[PDB]
Each structure stands twice: as structure tokens, then as C-alpha cells.
């Protein structure tokens, strides 16, 4: 009878727990699908996990990766005239007349 086994804040961004970790972190500005995938791989967090399931240490590691990319060797690539014109047109108009 005894068996013992929604929202998170990362980089000042709210991420839904129901979304997968990679596509949940994509919502963060400056984080793409490929970049989120690489960060998850570096963090050794299984990509199949939902954002809610993540443990505290895994979130801390992800924050460390994201804030400090170069230390973990993340690739770098991831990281008035109109008045003159109108006056000229007016002058041309006067010259025409």
C-alpha cells in the first residue's frame, strides 16, 4: 500500500514544466534548438526528460553552462536629407516654369 517514487525559473525566464527540456529552454532568448540540445548534452541531462522532472543540480549545471560557455569550450558561433531633396525638387519646378 506504501509506494513512494509545472513552472520553473531559469535565467530570469519562466519555462513550462510540461515542455521538453530542449524546447523549454528554446524559449529563453539567445537559446536555439541546437544550442539547447548541446547544453543538455554537456549537462548530462537526458533529453527525453520533461522540464519539470529536472533536479536542482541539473538546473544548476545548465545555468553554469549557459552563463560560462567558453570555459566548457562551447563553439563561438552559438554564443534632413529629405528636406534638401524636396527643396531641390521645388527649385527644379521653379526652373521649369
Amino acid at each position: 500500500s506504501l509506494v513512494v517514487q509545472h513552472i520553473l525559473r531559469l535565467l530570469n525566464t519562466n519555462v513550462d514544466g510540461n515542455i521538453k527540456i530542449v524546447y523549454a529552454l528554446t524559449t529563453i532568448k539567445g537559446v536555439g534548438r541546437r544550442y539547447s540540445n548541446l547544453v543538455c548534452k554537456k549537462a548530462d541531462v537526458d533529453l527525453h526528460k520533461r522540464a519539470g522532472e529536472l533536479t536542482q543540480e541539473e538546473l544548476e549545471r545548465i545555468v553554469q553552462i549557459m552563463q560560462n560557455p567558453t570555459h566548457y569550450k562551447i563553439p563561438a558561433w552559438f554564443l534632413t536629407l529629405a528636406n534638401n531633396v524636396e527643396s531641390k525638387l521645388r527649385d527644379d519646378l521653379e526652373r521649369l516654369k
Binding site: 529629405a82 528636406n83 531633396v85 524636396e86 525638387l89 521645388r90 527644379d92 519646378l93 521649369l96
Partner: protein, 51 residues
């Protein structure tokens, strides 16, 4: 039910052009229209004179 208020401009004049948040944006948009009108008129006049 949630209750929202309608957004409308008092003394609305559809012929009058829409109010713009940025004065510089309106002023340049005011003037690009003037340049286009003047350019089209003079081009019509020079063509007719040439003909």
C-alpha cells in the same frame, strides 16, 4: 466574464490621418507623402510640356 474597455479616439476624423506615437515618425511620414506627390506632379508636367 472578463470585462474590457473599447479603445477609440474622440473627435475621430477618418479623413484625418492616424495619430502616431512618435512625432519624428509622423513628421517624416508626413513628408515622404509630400515628396511623392510633388515628384509625380512635376514628372507629369515635364512630360506634357515635352509632348
Amino acid at each position: 466574464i472578463p470585462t474590457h474597455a473599447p479603445k477609440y479616439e474622440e473627435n475621430f476624423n477618418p479623413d484625418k490621418k492616424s495619430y502616431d506615437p512618435d512625432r519624428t515618425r509622423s513628421e517624416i511620414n508626413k513628408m515622404k507623402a509630400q515628396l511623392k506627390k510633388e515628384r509625380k506632379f512635376t514628372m507629369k508636367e515635364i512630360r506634357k510640356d515635352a509632348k
